[PDB]
């Protein structure tokens, strides 16, 4: 099972961030399977952005709602995340992670991407 992030890593403020997690080893058509995004500032704790189950349940972080749109492109086995109005405080690493089934309860974040350092400056 593998994940990999990609997009533009540097953008000025008042612009929009786009990221694309292309994965391999699971499909967002089975039951259970889902894909999420988590950002982490440099030297800080993690933060949850959004999540999208296999039946298209687009959960969002409320405080970051009204800014986020998550969508899937299952045909290409890839997911796209979008966050507008970037700022220098949004400099972080963005991982795309996987939630599958366990043995008596769903597993969450068992496998991670490798991050994509995103800098917002000029």
């Amino acid at each position: 099972i593998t994940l990999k992030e990609s997009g533009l890593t540097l953008v000025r403020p008042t612009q929009t961030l786009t990221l694309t997690c292309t994965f391999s080893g699971f499909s967002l058509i089975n039951s259970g399977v889902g894909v999420g995004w988590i950002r982490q500032p440099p030297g800080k704790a993690l933060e949850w952005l959004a999540l999208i189950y296999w039946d298209d349940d687009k959960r969002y972080n409320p405080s970051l709602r009204s800014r986020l749109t998550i969508s899937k492109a299952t045909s290409k086995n890839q997911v796209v995340l979008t966050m507008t109005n970037m700022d220098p405080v949004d400099t972080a690493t963005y991982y795309c992670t996987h939630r599958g089934p366990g043995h008596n309860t769903p597993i969450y974040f068992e496998f991670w991407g490798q991050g994509a350092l995103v800098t917002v400056s000029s």
Partner: protein, 49 residues
């Protein structure tokens, strides 16, 4: 031979006492290459109930 004539003394001659028949040594069942299982793996491993 005595049992057929019901007599302890049998006279000179030829007598047809019984018959013999080799018995079957095995039993076999033979049916065609029958292979066409129906989809239980589709209703139990369905994608979304």
């Amino acid at each position: 031979t005595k049992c057929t004539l019901k007599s302890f003394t049998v006279e000179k001659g030829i007598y047809q006492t019984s018959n013999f028949r080799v018995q079957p040594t095995e039993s076999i069942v033979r049916f065609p290459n029958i292979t066409n299982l129906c989809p239980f793996d589709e209703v139990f491993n369905a994608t979304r109930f």
